[model samples]
Target: GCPPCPREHELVAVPCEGLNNCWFVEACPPC
Candidate 1:
């Protein structure tokens, strides 16, 4: 996968991974 930023703003990579078959939400509010 890749990172993308909306609103024509820059975004940094936030490390995240799945564990025990559970994973973070696919989409999150802009940071």
Candidate 2:
């Protein structure tokens, strides 16, 4: 799992918690 404010900003599948609840965030900008 990638942190919203992680040590390294990498493309990861962030789980929104629950079934099929996931998407890509922090693609760019103030990551």
Q: What value of lDDT does candidate 1 attain over all alpha carbons?
A: 0.33
Q: State which candidate has the highest TM-score.
A: 2
Candidate 2 — which residues are off by over 4 angstroms? 1-15, 24-31
Looking at candidate 2, the ten consecutive residues that score lowest on lDDT are 22-31
Residue-wise C-alpha lDDT for candidate 2, range 1-31, written one tens digit per residue? 4335434433356544335543433332233
Cα lDDT computed for each candidate against the true fold: 0.33, 0.39
Quote the lDDT for 8 in model 2.
43
Per-candidate TM vs. native? 0.14, 0.20
Candidate 1 C-alpha lDDT tens digits along 1-31: 2245323323234433334221233343234
lDDT of 2 at 27: 36
Candidate 2 deviation (Cα RMSD) = 7.5
